[PDB]
Symmetry: C2
Subunit: 300 residues, 2 copies
């Protein structure tokens, strides 16, 4: 058995992490080609954070107010711009370790690796999924702001997330690399409410299909259900509703197996009403919702 959670190797991202210091505020930055991307609230003090006028604060700053440091080599800022909620610091030196890279914006349910960094120095890497309430549940102590999330496909690094804020319940919020926030959040110390976190239904079904492929089949039933009936029961257990698009994505797994999607949906309904009863599925005593269909399909 076994579906352990693997994070992506982080070497290509480690050589892109820098330290940015504006005043007495220090966070992490992303050094690609000749630009350093960092959260724009690096220019704010704790008092400016409640009601920040970002345009008033930046007009008053000069290139020399920004200290960018890659290890011990200091970089020279020759220009600055603000794209949405990120600051773009143009430097005199290009990053020699720049990898092949893209910027992508992800949707809830999608997975990625996070390189947690403190003061320009990498400390750990973990795999996570964007929650349906646009939050991430990781370990981000004060100083991780600027840490990024990424996926590696054939030597191309796809940067999809940058950490900005810690929400009061312990969860985290951030933007894509273009500075657009994921969810309704803002970079102010206001009271912001994360919505209800729900279970990613399409991800549980893909993992249950992987269980059948690897032998575990004790949860299967002889029944089937319609989508409208399944969605009505799943709402009661805080499960995301299933759309026709989710059914079509699970198609390949329903062909390798003989179980139709609406048949797996009937089995999941029975698991929710009964429990696991001391038993385990692929080594897990809990239903896993952080494995996307794409990943299961590729690893059959």
């Amino acid at each position: 058995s076994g579906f352990r959670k693997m994070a992506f190797p982080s070497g290509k991202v480690e050589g892109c992490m820098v330290q940015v210091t504006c005043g007495t505020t220090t966070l992490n930055g992303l050094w690609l080609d000749d630009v350093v991307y960092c959260p724009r609230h690096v220019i704010c003090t704790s008092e400016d954070m409640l009601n920040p006028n970002y345009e008033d604060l930046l007009i008053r700053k000069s290139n020399h107010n920004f200290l960018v440091q890659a290890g011990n080599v200091q970089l020279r800022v020759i220009g600055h711009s603000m794209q949405n909620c990120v600051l773009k610091l143009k430097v005199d030196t290009a990053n020699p370790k720049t990898p092949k890279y893209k910027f992508v914006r992800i949707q809830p349910g999608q997975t990625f690796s996070v390189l947690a960094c403190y003061n320009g120095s990498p400390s750990g890497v973990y795999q996570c999924a964007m929650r349906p309430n646009f939050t991430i549940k990781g370990s981000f102590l004060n100083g991780s702001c600027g840490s990024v999330g990424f996926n590696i496909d054939y030597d191309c690094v796809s940067f999809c997330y940058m950490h900005h804020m810690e929400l009061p319940t312990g969860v985290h919020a951030g933007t894509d690399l273009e500075g657009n926030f994921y969810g309704p959040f803002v970079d102010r110390q206001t009271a912001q409410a994360a919505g209800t976190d729900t279970t990613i239904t399409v991800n549980v079904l893909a993992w249950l299909y992987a269980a059948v492929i690897n032998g575990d089949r004790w949860f299967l039933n002889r029944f089937t259900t319609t989508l409208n009936d399944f969605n009505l029961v799943a709402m009661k257990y805080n499960y995301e509703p299933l759309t026709q698009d989710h059914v079509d994505i699970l198609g390949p797994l329903s062909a390798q197996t003989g179980i139709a999607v609406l048949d797996m949906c009937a089995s999941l309904k029975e698991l929710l009403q009964n429990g696991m009863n001391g038993r385990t599925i692929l080594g897990s005593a809990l239903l896993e919702d952080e494995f996307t269909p794409f990943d299961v399909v590729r690893q059959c």
Copy 2:
């Protein structure tokens, strides 16, 4: 709370592919030596009952193909240290980091860079099980994958994957070829013993829940080591020692909760259960966070 693995950059540059005949696996390139499992010289027929000493005197330096990406390294020498083959190559690895070879003990944690044909594919944090096995995602082609820890600039290599057991678990050696556990490198029926739960690691995780504010399991009672070790053994939990109490001492001062006071909470959670509740999000008690892991990820 999340199980974070070490950054893998310093090890990614040392991964190579070793091919002898039809067998292709992963090797570790440090200075001018390539380390890899010695069963790379064995055919499927030889694996039944192998005489490695004889199978190697026949092999020559031209029977080994070592590839670092697109460059091909030239083997100019070979040797065996226990269950690891050491291939001397012509070029030194310019990405050799500050490194050391250490042997760890059951219950200790480390990160594994799972590789396939010399290509790094994934990284994960795991703990050496008390039965000397590791639960992991290795699949096939991952033989020679390495486990490591990072102390400042020094990478400590502590494990190399050799075999997969039919329980879905994996077995291996240290970098000096000394196996962890009663396994041998032959295709035979091999069985892992009763896996027990690492008690010192659960107590460290309970200290982290209190640091994080989850303090419901806390009780006014205290127990003694022998009193708890009875319930521990009955519930398949590793006996606790005085040294275990001394290592948790730091976390006992950041919290105010003493080890035997906290042991009375664990005893209640084993017999009574969570009475329908959650600690740090789980219904189960985690045992793959050492006391040192908790101190570094929190304090």
